[PDB]
């Protein structure tokens, strides 16, 4: 069943657009910033070369949005959270933190 769930996800990822945000939700050290940035880049490579997804430069034009934290950690002033808030107050994009994403990609058979 997880095997079937992976094959369904794998086939669907070939027809998905992924966006990786540049905004950090909160204050971190230069070390924590660097570690996240490295993972973001590794994740971008997994989606484009292994999962075969399209990489979108506009998060408003993508199916899955990779964040530098949880959406609840993002400030009200941030464009990514302003966009998120609209999709709640209107009846379809996905918002995954890098940690959530890293685990999903592990579940796809790819470990950073």
């Amino acid at each position: 069943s997880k095997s079937s769930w992976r094959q369904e996800w794998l086939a669907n990822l070939k027809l998905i657009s992924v966006s990786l945000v540049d905004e950090f939700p909160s204050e971190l050290s230069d070390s924590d910033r660097q570690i996240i940035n490295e993972k973001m880049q590794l994740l971008k490579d997994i989606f484009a070369n292994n999962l075969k997804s399209a990489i979108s430069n506009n998060f408003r034009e993508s199916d899955i949005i990779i964040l530098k934290g949880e959406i609840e950690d993002y400030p009200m002033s941030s464009e990514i959270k302003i966009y998120y808030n609209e999709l709640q107050n209107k009846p379809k994009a996905r918002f995954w933190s890098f940690m959530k994403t890293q685990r999903f990609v592990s579940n796809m058979g790819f470990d950073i």
């Binding site: 997880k2 769930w5 669907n12 027809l15 379809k92 996905r94 579940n107």
Partner: peptide
């Protein structure tokens, strides 16, 4: 196209 991101429990 909108199946769960989390594996089945």
């Amino acid at each position: 196209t909108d199946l769960p991101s989390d594996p089945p429990s």
